[PDB]
């Protein structure tokens, strides 16, 4: 490996942890392409997240980010976020970007362009409706799914359908993003960031922050269960997506995070601890199960097991209880 590429994998290992391992196991040209895609998205996200950068200054950075991939000198030395190194050493990342085959570059640049436009759109609004929730998640995560799928198809290890079915790829990304948003309520609230959709939470409390108050715990958990139920509606598309993958390393790369997100939602379901910090995800149980689960029947079995755990815990009086049973029964019969 070149020194710059070595550096990129160091950055991947430092700034991911969640994806670092599955990425390094990808076959042939997919490995570098996905590594660089990850690092580029990490840089863009680090700009978006940085609340020390004013809106006026941030908007052009997000819009023009895709063009910086082609500016060999471009770096950003003003970030105060924890992943700032990817911005300060951006030339190393963009150089390895320009070392990828054109067919990968085109995908990565296009997704970066579209993500930047979408992230900037949300700088001046919170998330209101459930449709707006889906739109924000599309911009920050569904497009990652679509990008990854287009990389898989461009590599020719997967069929054109994987890249073409943007709805299924979008659902894959939405499922991860919604799960993270649900899980991270308190951390986000403490850092002054709000991602739960107002049209949902405002039916329970007057301010999203009010879910951190102990007197509102019952309402908080109702809202939590409603949002979890919404996220579960992506699982049918996740199953469809995973069922089409031919390459073992691509299958593992795609399946592992989805299962971890399912285990997370199961741990969060009807759980007061969401509102007091990190909940005990039985993530060890999921990691252990996924070691062996390298095919669709094994992954389905795991999905059902976690759905069954949620199902038998649905409180009779929970306002979403009928909906939660309904989506679980649908998933079971996919
Ligand atoms: C494969 C496919 C079609 C779609 C999946 C698309 C993906 C990967 C969307 C990413 C969504 C999120 C929330 C990643 C952060 S999890 P994290 O914070 O634990 O990740 P990290 O450790 O920062 O790398
Ligand atoms: C596997 C692969 C090719 C790419 C990984 C997906 C990445 C890094 C997407 C960048 C934008 C997002 C949604 C970061 C979520 S981690 P977070 O804790 O920063 O979530 P937040 O942006 O605050 O909503
Ligand atoms: Mg962000
Ligand atoms: Mg988060």
Breaks (C-N over 2.5 A) in the chain follow: none
Residue 302 CA: distances (Å) to CA of 149, 242, 260, 279: 23, 13, 11, 20
C-alpha to C-alpha distances, 89 to 12, 83, 258, nearest whole angstrom: 13, 11, 31
Which residue has the CA at smallest separation from atom 23 of ligand 2?
A: 49
Query: Are the C-beta atoms of residues 267 and 182 closer than 8 Å to each other?
Result: no
| 164 marked as binding residue | no
What is the H or E stretch that residue 250 is in?
A: helix 248-268
Structure tokens at 51: 């609340």
Domains of the chain: total:
1
Measuring CA to CA, which residue among 244, 329, 257 is closest to residue 293? 257
Q: What is the distance between the alpha carbons of residues 304 and 250, in angstroms, rounded to a whole number? A: 22
Q: How far is CA 73 from CA 68, 92, 95, 203, in A?
A: 9, 9, 10, 50
Give the residue numbers marked as catalytic.
136, 183, 193, 253
Please report, for the domain that includes residue 172, its CATH number. 1.10.600.10
In angstroms, the CA 55 to CA 194 distance is: 16
- Rounded Cα distance between 24 and 72, Å, is 25
299 backbone dihedrals φ, ψ, rounded to 5°:
-65, -45
d(CA 241, CA 245): 7
Domain hosting 68: range is 1-334
Contact yes or no for 64/84 (Cβ under 8 A): no
Contacts of 122 (CB under 8 A, 6+ apart): 136, 139
Question: What resolution in angstroms, rounded to 1 decimal?
Answer: 1.8
Q: Which of 9, 154, 14, 24 is nearest to 93 (CA)?
A: 9
Question: Residue holding tokens 């979403």?
Answer: 320
Nearest CA-CA partner of 70 in 109, 28, 126, 22: 109
Under a CB-based contact definition with an 8 Å cutoff, are residues 12 and 39 in contact? yes
CA angle 234, 210, 192 (to 5 degrees): 75
Tokens of 61: 């950075």
**CA geometry: angle at 304 spanning 180 and 225, to 5°?**
45
Judge whether 48 is annotated as a binding position: yes
With b meaning 16 or more CB within 10 Å and e meaning fewer, what string describes 145-166?
bbbbbbbbbbbebbeeebbebe
Which tokens go with 8? Answer: 């990129």
Question: Solved how?
Answer: X-ray
Residue 315 is encoded by which pair of tokens?
A: 């409180």
User: Can you tell me which atom of ligand 1 is nearest the CA of 241?
Assistant: 3
What radius of gyration do the chain's Cα atoms show?
20
Q: Is residue 270 within 8 Å of residue 225, measured between CB atoms?
A: yes
Q: Report which of 281, 115, 105 is spatially closest to residue 182, judged by C-alpha positions.
A: 281
Contact yes or no for 100/56 (Cβ under 8 A): no
**Cα separation of 30 and 151, whole Å?**
7
CA-CA distance, 162 to 316, in Å (whole number)?
A: 40
Pocket-forming residues, ligand 1, beta carbon under 6 Å? 16-19, 141, 144-145, 148-149, 169, 172-173, 176-177, 180, 254
How many angstroms is it from 305 CA to the middle of ligand 3?
31
282 burial (CB, 10 Å; 0-12 / 13-18 / 19+) is: middle
Query: What angle in degrees, to the nearest 10, is found between the helix axes of 235-243 and 321-333?
Result: 10
* Nearest bound ligand to the CA of residue 182: 4
Q: Are 87 and 65 in contact (CB under 8 A)?
A: no
- DSSP 3-state of 316: coil
Q: Tell me the helix, strand and coil percentages in the chain, rounded to 5.
A: 75, 0, 25
Take residue 257 and report the two structure tokens written for it.
Answer: 């995070």
The CA angle 145-195-108, to the nearest 5 degrees, is 25
SS (H, E, C) 92-160: HHHHHHHHCCHHHHHHHHHHHHHHHHHHHHHHHCCCCCHHHHHHHHHHHHHHHHHHHHHHHHHHCCCCH
Q: Which residues contact 190 (CB under 8 A, 6 or more apart)?
A: none
């Amino acid at each position: 490996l070149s020194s710059s590429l070595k550096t990129c994998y160091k950055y991947l290992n430092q700034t991911s942890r969640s994806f670092a391992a599955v990425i390094q196991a990808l076959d042939g040209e997919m490995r570098n392409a996905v590594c660089i895609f990850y690092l580029v998205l990490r840089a863009l996200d680090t700009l978006e997240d940085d609340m020390t950068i004013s809106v006026e200054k941030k908007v052009p950075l997000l819009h023009n980010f895709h063009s910086f991939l082609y500016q060999p000198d471009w770096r950003f030395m003003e970030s105060k976020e924890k992943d700032r190194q990817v911005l300060e050493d951006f030339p190393t990342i963009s150089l390895e970007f320009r070392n990828l085959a054109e067919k990968y570059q085109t995908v990565i640049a296009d997704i970066c362009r579209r993500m930047g436009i979408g992230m900037a759109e949300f700088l001046d609004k919170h998330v209101t409706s459930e449709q707006e929730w889906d739109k924000y998640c599309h911009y920050v995560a569904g497009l990652v799914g679509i990008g990854l799928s287009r990389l898989f198809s461009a590599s020719e290890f997967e069929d054109p359908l994987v890249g073409e079915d943007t709805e299924r790829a979008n659902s894959m990304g939405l499922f991860l993003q919604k799960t993270n948003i649900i899980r991270d309520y308190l951390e986000d609230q403490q850092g002054g960031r709000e991602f739960w959709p107002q049209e949902v939470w405002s039916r329970y409390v007057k301010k999203l922050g009010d879910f951190a108050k102990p007197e509102n715990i019952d309402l908080a958990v109702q809202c939590l269960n409603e949002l979890i139920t919404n996220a579960l509606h992506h699982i049918p598309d996740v199953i469809t997506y995973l069922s089409r993958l031919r390459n073992q390393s691509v299958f593992n790369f795609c399946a592992i995070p989805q299962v971890m997100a399912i285990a997370t939602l199961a741990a969060c379901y009807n759980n007061q601890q969401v509102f007091k910090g990190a909940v005990k995800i039985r993530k060890g149980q999921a990691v252990t199960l996924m070691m062996d689960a390298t095919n669709m029947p094994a992954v389905k079995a795991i999905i059902y097991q976690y759905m069954e755990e949620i199902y038998h815990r649905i409180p009779d009086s929970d306002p979403s209880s009928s909906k939660t049973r309904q989506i679980i029964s649908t998933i079971r019969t996919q």
